[PDB]
């Protein structure tokens with residue numbers, strides 16, 4: 340089991356870290372959601388699907404910077420939504436193919452009442468998402484740590 344990103348980096352068997360750079364909507368209004376879709380950013384596969392079934396969760400999602408100070412919201416993982424920043428580990432998604440498969444995570448972030456002007460700065464860390472991979476074969480339990488950065492400013496109009 341290993342993963343790759345839309346920025347051309349990887350995390351191998353056994354886990355590790357990577358940076359992810361996301362283009363964000365430049366304007367998000369109060370009462371609306373900024374969508375941060377990681378399924379177009381992070382892709383993984385199973386290295387021995389003939390025998391082994393891989394299981395993958397979002398173990399943890401944390402907010403930083405302007406997201407932490409100016410937004411609330413949720414994370415959608417494989418069709419179900421949960422609070423973000425996270426308060427539990429999600430259910431597992433099965434990876435059962437050598438073919439790349441997106442990691443089905445998206446953040447839905449809404450600006451808090453006090454937000455205005457530039458609410459997320461270009462280049463800033465917005466989130467850390469921890470993917471936890473196990474299987475039905477051995478005792479492997481690996482963390483793939485995704486540091487999510489904004490590629491651009493996000494403004495919340497007054």
Ligand SMILES: O=C(O)c1ccc(C(=O)Nc2ccc(O[C@H]3O[C@H](CO)[C@@H](O)[C@H](O)[C@@H]3O)c(Cl)c2)cc1
Pocket residue numbers: 340341352353384385386387388391392393473474476477479
């Ligand atoms: O035809 C043959 O002779 C043959 C075929 C296959 C193998 C084999 O044993 N292959 C093999 C490949 C990868 C393996 O582990 C990694 O990938 C799995 C599946 O994603 C992960 O769950 C796991 O955490 C880890 O990342 C493991 Cl334990 C085993 C040996 C011999």
